[PDB]
Amino acid sequence: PTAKLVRLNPRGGDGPGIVFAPPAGGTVLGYIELARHLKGFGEIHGVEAPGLGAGETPVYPSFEEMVQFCSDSAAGVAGDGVYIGGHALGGHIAFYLATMLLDRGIRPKGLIILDTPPRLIPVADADLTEEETKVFILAMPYEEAKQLLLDRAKNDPRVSAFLSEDYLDRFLRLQMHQLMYSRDVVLPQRKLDIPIHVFRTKNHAPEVARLFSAWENYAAGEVTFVDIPGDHATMLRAPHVSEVAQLLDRHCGLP
Numbered sequence: 001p002t003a004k005l006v007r008l009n010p011r012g013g014d015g016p017g018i019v020f021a022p023p024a025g026g027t028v029l030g031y032i033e034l035a036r037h038l039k040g041f042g043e044i045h046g047v048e049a050p051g052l053g054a055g056e057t058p059v060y061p062s063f064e065e066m067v068q069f070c071s072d073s074a075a076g077v078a079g080d081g082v083y084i085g086g087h088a089l090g091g092h093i094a095f096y097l098a099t100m101l102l103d104r105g106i107r108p109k110g111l112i113i114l115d116t117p118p119r120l121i122p123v124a125d126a127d128l129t130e131e132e133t134k135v136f137i138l139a140m141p142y143e144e145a146k147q148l149l150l151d152r153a154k155n156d157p158r159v160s161a162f163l164s165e166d167y168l169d170r171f172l173r174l175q176m177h178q179l180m181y182s183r184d185v186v187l188p189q190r191k192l193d194i195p196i197h198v199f200r201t202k203n204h205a206p207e208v209a210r211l212f213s214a215w216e217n218y219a220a221g222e223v224t225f226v227d228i229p230g231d232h233a234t235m236l237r238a239p240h241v242s243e244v245a246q247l248l249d250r251h252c253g254l255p
Helices: 029-037 063-078 089-103 130-139 142-155 157-162 165-179 206-218 240-252
Strands: 005-009 017-021 044-047 082-087 110-114 196-200 223-227
Touching: 005 029, 005 063, 017 063, 017 089, 029 044, 029 240, 044 063, 063 082, 063 089, 082 089, 089 110, 110 240, 130 142, 130 165, 142 157, 142 165, 196 206, 196 240, 206 223, 223 240
Parallel strands: 017 044, 017 082, 082 110, 110 196, 196 223
Antiparallel strands: 005 044
16 A cells, blocks of 8 residues: 555645545546645655556455555655645545544644535536536446546547556546445544645535535534635646645645
């Protein structure tokens, strides 16, 4: 598990580091741009899910085994003082990851949630047809639904030109597997004593937007809700990710 701890950015500031848990599909590539723009943090790491690397066998662990894998991978660096962060499904894993680190005698500096409410999940849906959006809704003929998302990705020249087709296949298989994760998790979810920071976009449906406030129920101390530009996907890409990084530096970092 420690071989899948990816250092996304060397120390740039004086504040603590961050260890990100990956979203549905298990990849940390989505945190690259954000990590490069961060100025007031220590080392920025991300936990790449097992089985995505080219020299690995595809594996499909449960939600709980994924939390354990992330805890085992991050425990080494988490002892140097770091936030635990997560975007999308990664935000749910992050809550349980911080909890499991507390059980191992490692206290994270805080919990950083990137535009997801508690597991009581939003989907971009902006650049997807009605037929393609149905797959995510249904997931949350199997091989036909997977082929729809596969052909959609390949239509993008950035995917067909630079992304490994083996990596894309492994990501999609794991994404489908994780989208089907049961809602309930066989892990405790008591209130955390560490501060929680929720960075949320302002393009959510009322059913999702109202659910963000439920993060208060999982905090015994400080909770902070910060508005960020973009939607659930574009927040991590230009031109928004620059402002997202600035807000993370302001609220959680120390340049």
